[PDB]
UniProtKB/Swiss-Prot annotation:
A motif (SH3-binding) lies at residues 68-74. GO terms for biological process: positive regulation of cytoplasmic translational initiation; proteasome-mediated ubiquitin-dependent protein catabolic process. It is linked to Promotes breast cancer progression by enhancing the interaction between E3 ligase STUB1 and PFN1, thereby promoting proteasomal degradation of PFN1 and subsequent activation of downstream signaling pathways including PI3K/AKT, NF-kB and WNT. Promotes autophagy presumably by stabilizing the ubuiquitin-like protein ATG12. Enhances mRNA translation of E3 ligase STUB1 and the autophagy-related protein PIK3C3. Promotes activation and phosphorylation of ERBB2 at 'Tyr-877' and 'Tyr-1196', and prolongs localization of ERBB2 to the cell membrane. Pfam families: SH3BGR. Gene3D superfamilies: Glutaredoxin (3.40.30.10). It comes from the Eukaryota. Belongs to the SH3BGR family. The SH3-binding motif is buried in the tertiary structure, and it is therefore unclear whether it directly mediates protein-binding. This is Adapter SH3BGRL.
Amino acid sequence: GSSGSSGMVIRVYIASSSGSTAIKKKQQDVLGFLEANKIGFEEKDIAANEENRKWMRENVPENSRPATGYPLPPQIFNESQYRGDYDAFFEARENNAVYAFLGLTAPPGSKEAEVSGPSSG
């Protein structure tokens, strides 16, 4: 086990074929971000592809699972493991620790690397 190539793929399970604008937005909020941040993520649709949704559902942690009706998108997933939803995404964002919440790396000089200030989760 050893190599020198970029990895850690960020797979997100969205529902392209969704209806609730909020969702669409949220999803687009998680995607747009990874896009604006030029992050190496993957767009996984749950609407069409069931396995993705199902599998994902079987992956999603209970502590993360809602009351009932499977976890709603967006849904961030590290390759296969689960990270969090738009909620966990935003939170990790405000805390400028998204990359960490995605198991990614932060750039040297950014606020993610700087991390210097009082009152911090």
